[PDB]
Amino acid sequence: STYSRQIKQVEDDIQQLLKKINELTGIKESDTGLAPPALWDLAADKQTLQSEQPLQVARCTKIINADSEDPKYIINVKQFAKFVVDLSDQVAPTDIEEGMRVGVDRNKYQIHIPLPPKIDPTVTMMQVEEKPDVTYSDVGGCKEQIEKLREVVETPLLHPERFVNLGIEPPKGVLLFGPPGTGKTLCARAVANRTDACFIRVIGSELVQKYVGEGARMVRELFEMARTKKACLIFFDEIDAIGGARFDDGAGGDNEVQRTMLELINQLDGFDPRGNIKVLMATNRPDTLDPALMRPGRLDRKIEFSLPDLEGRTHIFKIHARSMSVERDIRFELLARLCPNSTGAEIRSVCTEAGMFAIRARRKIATEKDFLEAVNKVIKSYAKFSATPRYMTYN
Amino acid sequence: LDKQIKEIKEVIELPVKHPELFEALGIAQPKGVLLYGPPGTGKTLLARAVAHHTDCTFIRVSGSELVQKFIGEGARMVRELFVMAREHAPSIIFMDEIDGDSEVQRTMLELLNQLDGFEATKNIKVIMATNRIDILDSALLRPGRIDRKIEFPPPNEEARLDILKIHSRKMNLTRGINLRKIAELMPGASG
Amino acid sequence: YDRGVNTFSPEGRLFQVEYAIEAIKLGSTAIGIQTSEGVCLAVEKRITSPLMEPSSIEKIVEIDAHIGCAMSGLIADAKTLIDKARVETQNHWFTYNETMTVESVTQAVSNLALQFGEEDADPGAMSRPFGVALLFGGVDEKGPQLFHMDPSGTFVQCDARAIGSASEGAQSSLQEVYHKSMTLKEAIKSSLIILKQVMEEKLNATNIELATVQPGQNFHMFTKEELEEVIKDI
Amino acid sequence: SYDRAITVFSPDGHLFQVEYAQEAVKKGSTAVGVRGRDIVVLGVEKKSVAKLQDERTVRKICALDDNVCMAFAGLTADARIVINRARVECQSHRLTVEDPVTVEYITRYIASLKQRYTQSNGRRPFGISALIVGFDFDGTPRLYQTDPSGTYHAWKANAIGRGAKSVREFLEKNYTDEAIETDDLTIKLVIKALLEVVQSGGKNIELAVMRRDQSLKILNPEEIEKYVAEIEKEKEENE
Amino acid sequence: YEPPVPTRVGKKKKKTKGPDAASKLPLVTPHTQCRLKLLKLERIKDYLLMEEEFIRNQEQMKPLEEKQEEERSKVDDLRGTPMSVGTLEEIIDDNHAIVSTSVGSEHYVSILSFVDKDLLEPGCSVLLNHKVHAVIGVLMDDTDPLVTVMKVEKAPQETYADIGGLDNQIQEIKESVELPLTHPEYYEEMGIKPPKGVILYGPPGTGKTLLAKAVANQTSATFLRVVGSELIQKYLGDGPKLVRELFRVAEEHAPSIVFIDEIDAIGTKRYDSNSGGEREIQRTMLELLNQLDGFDSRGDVKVIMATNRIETLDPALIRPGRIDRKIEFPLPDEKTKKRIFQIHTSRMTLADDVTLDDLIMAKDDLSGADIKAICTEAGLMALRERRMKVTNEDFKKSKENVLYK
Ligand SMILES: Nc1ncnc2c1ncn2[C@@H]1O[C@H](COP(=O)(O)OP(=O)(O)OP(=O)(O)O)[C@@H](O)[C@H]1O
Ligand SMILES: Nc1ncnc2c1ncn2[C@@H]1O[C@H](COP(=O)(O)OP(=O)(O)OP(=O)(O)O)[C@@H](O)[C@H]1O
Ligand SMILES: Nc1ncnc2c1ncn2[C@@H]1O[C@H](COP(=O)(O)OP(=O)(O)O)[C@@H](O)[C@H]1O
Ligand SMILES: [Mg+2]
Ligand SMILES: [Mg+2]
Ligand SMILES: [Mg+2]
């Protein structure tokens, strides 16, 4: 307390200093999206505002007299107008093709720069940019499943040399199916963490849209954007939202959604080659999927995430009880035997609830009795709401 | 509807004008009223009358997509109207069920759930008008949801005379019209 | 549901038969060992409350004086199978004046399994498989014999078979300890060692059952004093 | 005839109809049975006691025979069928073996009857659990409990119904040889067990007793109220 | 020609939002007023004196054109007026992007240096120069009307003390929505993440919404309340879109508690306004499956669900990992009924002839809602008769109104 008076004097002087420092340094405000003044190259911006002129985005439609020395280009300037223009002197004639987006000026509308194809911002955000914090070491009881998943979606990209030499075309699709909590998305999250190619996450509910032809359109732009990369991965979590089997119920039952599935089926295996995309589908209801989608060439590998066995459940218990402050003699083999048909999600809850019984008792170490009570609360007491009994019939 | 006027007054007028009466009594102020009866019995007439007499803004929520631009450009959930209701407090939010499941009764639940304890501003009452009370969802019929249910029976011989007297005042009537006989000539009729 | 009881999976599995097999993993662990000196049957009672009398939990059943059965899974379902076994036996004795072979007794009980149906069945016919695995053990002309039965009606002679919740763990331990030429005392001791390691509780003379069928001797239920003698070692 | 498999195996290996029947037991009134030295005791919570209800007709404690009686917990209509079926077999056993039925035998038959309804076409399982008490021919007190699956066990003291878990926890801690030394102490143990879930008190307690070489005796409310005062009196001196 | 190659990794904005910016002063430890804290604070003060002297010297000999007020005054000149509000379509390069004006016309413009490049994502609202349409700022999007509706601005006045009889129910909900925030050390020392989700189920009027009101009263996290019937939309895909947007707002306001009250109403109620039938509801359900436990990493978002019909829910929705705890809310017993009656009559002025014991057995299946409705109506009877004291006759006439008719 003898320094309480001296603390506030230097604290207030400090707070006055930051307020003083920010006065000369600047960076106050940001509501208009202003960068800190240390990054202001105002000399270049003034030149940029003059030397670099703005360019209107237009789409080339038809090239007239491409063979001759006077090739005229018809452009569609979005909602503005249509113009027959010629190329600029700084762009090669072979760099502009019909149907591609171009940048045109506001005076003579001459094409100045070819542009990337238009892609829905929603589809762009569907690509993964921060890899998840899940590795293959966090998945227990899925050894054989994981090798099959890696050798299709991870190995060919990592070491492509061992497939071209033998004339091998690796499978370009994997379907992960199993009851909820079995680890379908967990293994996919492990794939994204390890993969170095582009990973796109698609949820089947994201492909359901208000207007007619959107879900097919978003699939088209999804694969169009995936094809602009040397290697790509598309994850379709809960494909059964749009992957349901086609049917005719008199009325237009699920006609629009079926078209979205048909477009996805067309991109996977149609007239045109798909590219270097390896798709990954996860669903807890594989019985509802369309037969054409469940066909090799679209879903070549069908990896089943069945309920873990005794060895697998013991492995999952160790994974989730790795960081627990457990006792010395916790019989995890016994715990795995007390939940015969239990998902890995239940085992995680058992581990979490086991520490909850100890935290409730103000104990810093969870005994084996807490895990025994956790199994009764999770595996037994919560067995009324278990999704396993109904979903094993679907898988 | 003298009995109905008194019933709706203690539920919509007293909480707005005199919140201290309920605080002294130790009861929560009413927030949901249900007016049920045959069509044309005056449910909308009374609900509008209270809002006119207590200076409470009267908002009719028909669920029409024509008025959706005024409620808000979002239009995803019906509680977006609460922004306009708070700005005009005290407010009376009225939905009439013309009579799938009833959207008016669905809107009742969404508005009543917000008004339970999740609404900060007070003096926002809500009313439903329905033809029958036995068709209501069990969620609305649950005690504590609707604070008072007011019945609007078809006018009897004396009430029909009062209604006949009210509307005939807007006409050039010859002296000596026996409106009592005319009321007797309309058994089981609405207002 | 839409599915009937007699429905085949796309993999050729009878759905109700496989589901009844999963019921055994919820039952108590039973260990049976076949030895030239006799057949030993061990099972855990799984006491769930101190007030419950352990004597009432009969999971080893005298089928006859020369054959005994250990049960795991749904105990209530095994009563029908046990009663038929105790009726089929003493029916062979009535007609042939001899003790039925252990294989024949297991075969007769096995025929009861899969005799379940929904339509075109007798009023007394069963509706679902028997979710209990049986471990028949006894002595006959072929000497001591141990047979394992499953809800699928598949019976097979086993040198040392463990059924129940810890069947996977106990069977692996059984293979590490079983040799063809050993004594019954080792078989009893080894079964108790394996059981003690797999039980949730602590092994004592009141939460387990031990049965032996020796040649010459009859089916014998191990008492508490007899159980304490072998438990006191391990 | 209706020949349909009501009870079938779930993919996990569970008989859901059996489990659902056990859930109906957990909705019934709490029945408590304590097996003493020379007396066996059945205590049943009377749920809600309407003053206009004839307490004689609504009785969860019924006598299958002169030496065996049981208290149930679950669907009242389902139990009466089991009681009548057991009562008929009590007389059939008596005419054949010329000896009153043992507590094992009537418990075994009821449990076997329960299991038959979990494996028969067109029949749903019985949704009741029974607390069978009585005396054998050698005078040994016996208490048995059956569940809708068809399993039966002998218990020193057990509870079935909505408050079974709490009472059985209470019975695990208080059931000692001293606590069953006399008939009065055995009676008080049931009331202490019943009062753990019964809220109002002795008004919602229906207690019936059976002594060796004696018929089932239903305790009058004044006798129960007399006992409740003793536990209340004994509570003060222990504080 | 070759396509421009961006130097920034990815096309999304920086995840961090609303930081201390340049004022991220270090966490000096300990907080106790002792010498080394004074010593630590002095070092912070010293470097500021060094920083203050250095910055002043540079600006002193900086050209008159290059000044802190001059450069900011210049920045307005480059921005100009008015500042057109557009939409970012694609980030071609670090200083180049495609933007679209409100008229639907796209322009390939240059992003100026002074714009916060870390705030730029496709679909964001950008500020463009009126003449050259160059990106000259990012408009902080105002709070959406949908954001305001979910957010409970004022905490409800119902506390845990106003809940009677739900001791175990209150305790379980605290360890999943209250204890992890107030005392996160208990979980960290134990090595377990808190229980992920919680659902409150039971008969109507048992206190499911009341416990959430108590939770919202004593929480430091943002509380978002959504009724399950609000997730049924009039158009295809907006159901999944609303669920996706609801959990996006929760992620922005982290830590947050999302209360999906009456979750079963999404399926147990069928409306003709919902264009897609049960199939669109299933797609909405699958979207909610992804949000509760899916591919996307979840921040400090706690989910509370309430339903009086838990048997009608999809079991995959309430599976562990999504909803870890299933708290049951039983009908009140004798002890709880008396507590609820004392809770709702505490502010009342009861008469000497009114006994709560008789009112306990008004009905066998009596819930907390019935008890509160009995009291509220009983007071209304006294208000009709112009009285402040509630009599037994007032309560007697109360039971025949709420419980019967
Ligand atoms: N094999 C496993 N090993 C370790 N943890 C597992 C395993 N399987 C599941 N889990 C745990 O259970 C959780 C369940 O989520 P997960 O994404 O794996 O489910 P899912 O199989 O995709 O289910 P759903 O069909 O409902 O989408 C995981 O987040 C993880 O913590
Ligand atoms: N256990 C209780 N203790 C105190 N008050 C209670 C209790 N249960 C209910 N209440 C009162 O009942 C009122 C209405 O009930 P509430 O809104 O909590 O119902 P609920 O259990 O969420 O059911 P539902 O949404 O299915 O109708 C609450 O505002 C509260 O005052
Ligand atoms: N009791 C009444 N007294 C006077 N006018 C009435 C009465 N009931 C109905 N009306 C007349 O009927 C018209 C419409 O009635 P309305 O209140 O819309 O019926 P509802 O109650 O079914 O909504 C009103 O313009 C009103 O003048
Ligand atoms: Mg998943
Ligand atoms: Mg009308
Ligand atoms: Mg509610």
PDB file of C-alpha atoms in Angstrom, chain A residues 1 3-4 7 10-11 13-14 17-18 20-21 24-25 30-36 39-42 45 48-49 52 54-57 78 95 101 106 113-118 125 127-129 180-181 185 188-189 192 199 201 203 205-206 208-210 235 237-238 240-241 247 249 254 257 323-325 345-346 348-349 351-353 355-356 358-360 363-364 377 382 385 387 390-391, chain E residues 1 10-12 15 23 25 33 35 38 41 44-45 48-49 51-52 55 59 68 71-72 74-75 78-79 89-90 92 96 98 104 106-108 110 112-116 121-123 127 131-134 137-140 171-172 175 186-187 189-193 195 201 235-237 240-241 244 279-280 283 286-287 289-290 294-297 310 314-316 318-322 324-326:
ATOM      1  CA  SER A   1       0.000   0.000   0.000  1.00  0.00           C
ATOM      2  CA  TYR A   3       3.303   2.279  -3.341  1.00  0.00           C
ATOM      3  CA  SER A   4      -0.413   2.788  -4.008  1.00  0.00           C
ATOM      4  CA  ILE A   7       1.432   3.508  -8.704  1.00  0.00           C
ATOM      5  CA  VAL A  10       2.908   6.655 -12.938  1.00  0.00           C
ATOM      6  CA  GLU A  11      -0.272   4.961 -14.193  1.00  0.00           C
ATOM      7  CA  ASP A  13       1.269   9.649 -16.484  1.00  0.00           C
ATOM      8  CA  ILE A  14       1.353   6.514 -18.639  1.00  0.00           C
ATOM      9  CA  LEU A  17       1.298   9.352 -22.570  1.00  0.00           C
ATOM     10  CA  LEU A  18      -0.653   6.903 -24.750  1.00  0.00           C
ATOM     11  CA  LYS A  20      -0.446  11.990 -26.107  1.00  0.00           C
ATOM     12  CA  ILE A  21       1.311   9.388 -28.278  1.00  0.00           C
ATOM     13  CA  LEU A  24       0.963  12.688 -32.982  1.00  0.00           C
ATOM     14  CA  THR A  25       0.992   9.024 -34.120  1.00  0.00           C
ATOM     15  CA  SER A  30     -11.629   3.150 -37.784  1.00  0.00           C
ATOM     16  CA  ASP A  31     -15.385   3.220 -38.474  1.00  0.00           C
ATOM     17  CA  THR A  32     -14.646   4.224 -42.079  1.00  0.00           C
ATOM     18  CA  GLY A  33     -12.162   1.347 -42.329  1.00  0.00           C
ATOM     19  CA  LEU A  34      -8.990   3.422 -42.018  1.00  0.00           C
ATOM     20  CA  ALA A  35      -5.645   1.670 -41.662  1.00  0.00           C
ATOM     21  CA  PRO A  36      -3.108   2.928 -39.098  1.00  0.00           C
ATOM     22  CA  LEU A  39       0.862   2.284 -43.560  1.00  0.00           C
ATOM     23  CA  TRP A  40      -0.193   5.453 -45.430  1.00  0.00           C
ATOM     24  CA  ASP A  41       1.725   5.776 -48.708  1.00  0.00           C
ATOM     25  CA  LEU A  42      -0.102   8.954 -49.679  1.00  0.00           C
ATOM     26  CA  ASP A  45      -1.948   6.851 -53.650  1.00  0.00           C
ATOM     27  CA  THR A  48      -2.348   5.672 -58.146  1.00  0.00           C
ATOM     28  CA  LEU A  49      -5.464   7.860 -58.280  1.00  0.00           C
ATOM     29  CA  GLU A  52      -4.094   3.917 -62.613  1.00  0.00           C
ATOM     30  CA  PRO A  54     -10.614   2.688 -62.963  1.00  0.00           C
ATOM     31  CA  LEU A  55     -11.757  -0.261 -65.056  1.00  0.00           C
ATOM     32  CA  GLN A  56     -15.327  -1.471 -65.561  1.00  0.00           C
ATOM     33  CA  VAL A  57     -15.875  -5.223 -65.361  1.00  0.00           C
ATOM     34  CA  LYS A  78     -22.950  -5.908 -66.736  1.00  0.00           C
ATOM     35  CA  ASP A  95      -5.054 -13.536 -73.761  1.00  0.00           C
ATOM     36  CA  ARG A 101     -14.535 -11.442 -67.862  1.00  0.00           C
ATOM     37  CA  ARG A 106     -14.831   4.315 -69.342  1.00  0.00           C
ATOM     38  CA  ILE A 113      -7.010  -6.686 -68.337  1.00  0.00           C
ATOM     39  CA  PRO A 114      -8.457 -10.214 -68.277  1.00  0.00           C
ATOM     40  CA  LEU A 115     -10.222 -10.953 -65.017  1.00  0.00           C
ATOM     41  CA  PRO A 116     -10.969 -14.018 -62.892  1.00  0.00           C
ATOM     42  CA  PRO A 117     -14.387 -15.617 -63.435  1.00  0.00           C
ATOM     43  CA  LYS A 118     -17.164 -14.346 -61.197  1.00  0.00           C
ATOM     44  CA  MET A 125     -16.103 -18.327 -47.959  1.00  0.00           C
ATOM     45  CA  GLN A 127     -13.051 -22.714 -48.518  1.00  0.00           C
ATOM     46  CA  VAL A 128     -11.123 -23.431 -45.321  1.00  0.00           C
ATOM     47  CA  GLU A 129      -8.496 -20.841 -44.425  1.00  0.00           C
ATOM     48  CA  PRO A 180     -23.848 -39.693 -35.179  1.00  0.00           C
ATOM     49  CA  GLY A 181     -20.804 -39.194 -32.985  1.00  0.00           C
ATOM     50  CA  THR A 185     -16.524 -34.883 -39.296  1.00  0.00           C
ATOM     51  CA  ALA A 188     -12.567 -34.768 -42.008  1.00  0.00           C
ATOM     52  CA  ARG A 189     -11.290 -32.052 -39.668  1.00  0.00           C
ATOM     53  CA  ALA A 192      -8.082 -30.431 -43.422  1.00  0.00           C
ATOM     54  CA  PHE A 199      -9.857 -27.497 -48.614  1.00  0.00           C
ATOM     55  CA  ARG A 201     -16.117 -27.257 -46.607  1.00  0.00           C
ATOM     56  CA  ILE A 203     -22.693 -28.265 -45.765  1.00  0.00           C
ATOM     57  CA  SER A 205     -27.994 -27.229 -45.965  1.00  0.00           C
ATOM     58  CA  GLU A 206     -25.879 -24.448 -47.505  1.00  0.00           C
ATOM     59  CA  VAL A 208     -30.531 -25.261 -50.324  1.00  0.00           C
ATOM     60  CA  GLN A 209     -31.520 -21.857 -51.686  1.00  0.00           C
ATOM     61  CA  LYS A 210     -34.652 -19.793 -52.188  1.00  0.00           C
ATOM     62  CA  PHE A 235     -15.831 -31.716 -48.042  1.00  0.00           C
ATOM     63  CA  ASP A 237     -20.758 -32.495 -44.629  1.00  0.00           C
ATOM     64  CA  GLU A 238     -24.296 -33.877 -44.347  1.00  0.00           C
ATOM     65  CA  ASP A 240     -28.077 -36.169 -47.328  1.00  0.00           C
ATOM     66  CA  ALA A 241     -29.543 -32.652 -47.153  1.00  0.00           C
ATOM     67  CA  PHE A 247     -38.475 -39.661 -56.694  1.00  0.00           C
ATOM     68  CA  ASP A 249     -44.578 -38.003 -55.787  1.00  0.00           C
ATOM     69  CA  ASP A 254     -37.844 -32.085 -53.795  1.00  0.00           C
ATOM     70  CA  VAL A 257     -32.982 -30.050 -54.499  1.00  0.00           C
ATOM     71  CA  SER A 323      -5.157 -34.426 -20.144  1.00  0.00           C
ATOM     72  CA  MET A 324      -7.438 -35.466 -17.264  1.00  0.00           C
ATOM     73  CA  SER A 325      -6.065 -35.437 -13.736  1.00  0.00           C
ATOM     74  CA  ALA A 345     -18.919 -38.690 -28.581  1.00  0.00           C
ATOM     75  CA  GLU A 346     -20.389 -40.554 -25.605  1.00  0.00           C
ATOM     76  CA  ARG A 348     -15.867 -37.897 -24.583  1.00  0.00           C
ATOM     77  CA  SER A 349     -18.895 -36.977 -22.464  1.00  0.00           C
ATOM     78  CA  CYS A 351     -14.581 -38.308 -19.681  1.00  0.00           C
ATOM     79  CA  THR A 352     -16.015 -34.801 -19.280  1.00  0.00           C
ATOM     80  CA  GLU A 353     -18.694 -35.923 -16.815  1.00  0.00           C
ATOM     81  CA  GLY A 355     -14.212 -34.800 -14.144  1.00  0.00           C
ATOM     82  CA  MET A 356     -17.528 -33.102 -13.384  1.00  0.00           C
ATOM     83  CA  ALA A 358     -14.891 -34.664  -9.045  1.00  0.00           C
ATOM     84  CA  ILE A 359     -15.205 -30.901  -9.591  1.00  0.00           C
ATOM     85  CA  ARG A 360     -18.608 -31.074  -7.894  1.00  0.00           C
ATOM     86  CA  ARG A 363     -11.659 -32.799  -5.725  1.00  0.00           C
ATOM     87  CA  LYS A 364      -8.757 -32.011  -8.046  1.00  0.00           C
ATOM     88  CA  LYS A 377     -25.182 -40.967 -16.259  1.00  0.00           C
ATOM     89  CA  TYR A 382     -29.030 -40.769 -21.241  1.00  0.00           C
ATOM     90  CA  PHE A 385     -32.033 -39.961 -26.115  1.00  0.00           C
ATOM     91  CA  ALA A 387     -29.236 -41.719 -31.552  1.00  0.00           C
ATOM     92  CA  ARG A 390     -32.202 -45.684 -34.778  1.00  0.00           C
ATOM     93  CA  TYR A 391     -29.175 -44.748 -36.897  1.00  0.00           C
TER      94      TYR A 391
ATOM     95  CA  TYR E   1       0.219 -11.029 -69.362  1.00  0.00           C
ATOM     96  CA  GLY E  10      -6.450 -16.281 -47.876  1.00  0.00           C
ATOM     97  CA  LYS E  11      -9.392 -14.109 -48.849  1.00  0.00           C
ATOM     98  CA  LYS E  12     -11.013 -13.618 -45.419  1.00  0.00           C
ATOM     99  CA  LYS E  15     -10.528 -13.109 -37.097  1.00  0.00           C
ATOM    100  CA  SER E  23      -3.226   0.468 -26.711  1.00  0.00           C
ATOM    101  CA  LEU E  25      -0.558  -2.509 -22.940  1.00  0.00           C
ATOM    102  CA  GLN E  33       0.926  -2.517  -5.283  1.00  0.00           C
ATOM    103  CA  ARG E  35       8.018  -2.388  -5.863  1.00  0.00           C
ATOM    104  CA  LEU E  38       6.203   0.036  -9.686  1.00  0.00           C
ATOM    105  CA  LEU E  41       5.241   0.264 -14.601  1.00  0.00           C
ATOM    106  CA  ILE E  44       6.484   1.093 -19.486  1.00  0.00           C
ATOM    107  CA  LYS E  45       6.636   4.784 -18.576  1.00  0.00           C
ATOM    108  CA  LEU E  48       6.884   6.011 -23.570  1.00  0.00           C
ATOM    109  CA  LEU E  49       9.160   8.956 -22.748  1.00  0.00           C
ATOM    110  CA  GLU E  51       8.723   7.056 -27.742  1.00  0.00           C
ATOM    111  CA  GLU E  52       7.353  10.548 -27.084  1.00  0.00           C
ATOM    112  CA  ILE E  55       8.152  10.888 -32.472  1.00  0.00           C
ATOM    113  CA  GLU E  59       7.515  15.417 -36.891  1.00  0.00           C
ATOM    114  CA  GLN E  68      -0.283  14.230 -38.673  1.00  0.00           C
ATOM    115  CA  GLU E  71      -1.867  13.837 -43.837  1.00  0.00           C
ATOM    116  CA  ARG E  72      -5.285  13.223 -42.282  1.00  0.00           C
ATOM    117  CA  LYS E  74      -4.990  15.096 -47.188  1.00  0.00           C
ATOM    118  CA  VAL E  75      -6.664  11.699 -46.698  1.00  0.00           C
ATOM    119  CA  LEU E  78      -7.977  11.592 -51.775  1.00  0.00           C
ATOM    120  CA  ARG E  79     -11.241  10.139 -50.467  1.00  0.00           C
ATOM    121  CA  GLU E  89     -16.856  -8.879 -54.754  1.00  0.00           C
ATOM    122  CA  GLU E  90     -13.314 -10.264 -55.038  1.00  0.00           C
ATOM    123  CA  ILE E  92      -7.722  -9.600 -57.108  1.00  0.00           C
ATOM    124  CA  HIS E  96      -6.715  -4.226 -56.455  1.00  0.00           C
ATOM    125  CA  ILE E  98     -13.607  -5.860 -57.862  1.00  0.00           C
ATOM    126  CA  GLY E 104     -25.322  -3.572 -59.827  1.00  0.00           C
ATOM    127  CA  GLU E 106     -18.948  -3.940 -61.097  1.00  0.00           C
ATOM    128  CA  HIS E 107     -15.677  -2.025 -61.356  1.00  0.00           C
ATOM    129  CA  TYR E 108     -12.064  -3.211 -61.174  1.00  0.00           C
ATOM    130  CA  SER E 110      -7.459   0.070 -56.866  1.00  0.00           C
ATOM    131  CA  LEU E 112      -5.696   2.770 -51.549  1.00  0.00           C
ATOM    132  CA  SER E 113      -2.999   2.425 -48.904  1.00  0.00           C
ATOM    133  CA  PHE E 114      -4.919   4.089 -46.060  1.00  0.00           C
ATOM    134  CA  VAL E 115      -7.719   1.490 -46.215  1.00  0.00           C
ATOM    135  CA  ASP E 116      -7.641  -1.196 -43.531  1.00  0.00           C
ATOM    136  CA  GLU E 121     -13.625  -9.754 -47.315  1.00  0.00           C
ATOM    137  CA  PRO E 122     -15.971 -10.484 -50.232  1.00  0.00           C
ATOM    138  CA  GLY E 123     -19.511  -9.395 -49.473  1.00  0.00           C
ATOM    139  CA  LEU E 127     -16.494   2.910 -49.246  1.00  0.00           C
ATOM    140  CA  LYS E 131     -15.375   9.670 -59.211  1.00  0.00           C
ATOM    141  CA  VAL E 132     -12.785   6.882 -59.506  1.00  0.00           C
ATOM    142  CA  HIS E 133     -14.633   4.252 -57.400  1.00  0.00           C
ATOM    143  CA  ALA E 134     -11.328   3.331 -55.734  1.00  0.00           C
ATOM    144  CA  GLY E 137     -12.578   2.645 -46.692  1.00  0.00           C
ATOM    145  CA  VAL E 138     -14.600  -0.136 -45.132  1.00  0.00           C
ATOM    146  CA  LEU E 139     -17.989   0.731 -43.668  1.00  0.00           C
ATOM    147  CA  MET E 140     -18.495  -0.906 -40.280  1.00  0.00           C
ATOM    148  CA  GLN E 171     -26.772 -26.866 -10.258  1.00  0.00           C
ATOM    149  CA  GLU E 172     -26.387 -28.761 -13.545  1.00  0.00           C
ATOM    150  CA  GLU E 175     -21.564 -26.031 -14.638  1.00  0.00           C
ATOM    151  CA  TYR E 186     -11.645 -25.718 -12.250  1.00  0.00           C
ATOM    152  CA  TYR E 187     -12.026 -27.111 -15.778  1.00  0.00           C
ATOM    153  CA  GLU E 189      -6.892 -28.038 -13.810  1.00  0.00           C
ATOM    154  CA  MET E 190      -9.133 -31.044 -14.523  1.00  0.00           C
ATOM    155  CA  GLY E 191      -8.194 -31.184 -18.208  1.00  0.00           C
ATOM    156  CA  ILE E 192     -11.759 -31.236 -19.566  1.00  0.00           C
ATOM    157  CA  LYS E 193     -13.620 -28.771 -21.712  1.00  0.00           C
ATOM    158  CA  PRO E 195     -20.103 -29.751 -21.092  1.00  0.00           C
ATOM    159  CA  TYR E 201     -37.051 -30.914 -20.916  1.00  0.00           C
ATOM    160  CA  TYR E 235     -38.909 -19.514 -48.282  1.00  0.00           C
ATOM    161  CA  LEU E 236     -36.572 -22.377 -49.088  1.00  0.00           C
ATOM    162  CA  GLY E 237     -33.135 -22.144 -47.501  1.00  0.00           C
ATOM    163  CA  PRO E 240     -30.943 -22.926 -42.655  1.00  0.00           C
ATOM    164  CA  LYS E 241     -29.814 -19.362 -43.399  1.00  0.00           C
ATOM    165  CA  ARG E 244     -26.448 -20.075 -39.809  1.00  0.00           C
ATOM    166  CA  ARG E 279     -38.074 -31.762 -45.983  1.00  0.00           C
ATOM    167  CA  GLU E 280     -37.166 -28.092 -45.507  1.00  0.00           C
ATOM    168  CA  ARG E 283     -32.549 -29.238 -43.875  1.00  0.00           C
ATOM    169  CA  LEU E 286     -29.151 -30.491 -40.457  1.00  0.00           C
ATOM    170  CA  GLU E 287     -27.908 -26.898 -40.445  1.00  0.00           C
ATOM    171  CA  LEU E 289     -26.511 -30.104 -36.465  1.00  0.00           C
ATOM    172  CA  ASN E 290     -23.527 -28.415 -38.117  1.00  0.00           C
ATOM    173  CA  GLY E 294     -19.729 -29.609 -37.089  1.00  0.00           C
ATOM    174  CA  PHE E 295     -16.697 -28.842 -39.229  1.00  0.00           C
ATOM    175  CA  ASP E 296     -16.399 -25.196 -38.183  1.00  0.00           C
ATOM    176  CA  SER E 297     -14.485 -24.556 -34.975  1.00  0.00           C
ATOM    177  CA  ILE E 310     -38.143 -34.288 -26.214  1.00  0.00           C
ATOM    178  CA  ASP E 314     -34.155 -35.858 -33.809  1.00  0.00           C
ATOM    179  CA  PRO E 315     -31.847 -37.945 -31.582  1.00  0.00           C
ATOM    180  CA  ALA E 316     -28.876 -36.791 -33.672  1.00  0.00           C
ATOM    181  CA  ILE E 318     -29.316 -33.849 -28.860  1.00  0.00           C
ATOM    182  CA  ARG E 319     -26.473 -36.364 -29.172  1.00  0.00           C
ATOM    183  CA  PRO E 320     -23.416 -35.976 -26.918  1.00  0.00           C
ATOM    184  CA  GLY E 321     -20.983 -33.497 -28.390  1.00  0.00           C
ATOM    185  CA  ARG E 322     -23.976 -31.390 -29.391  1.00  0.00           C
ATOM    186  CA  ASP E 324     -24.042 -33.128 -23.402  1.00  0.00           C
ATOM    187  CA  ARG E 325     -26.495 -32.650 -20.515  1.00  0.00           C
ATOM    188  CA  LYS E 326     -30.218 -33.471 -20.588  1.00  0.00           C
TER     189      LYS E 326
END
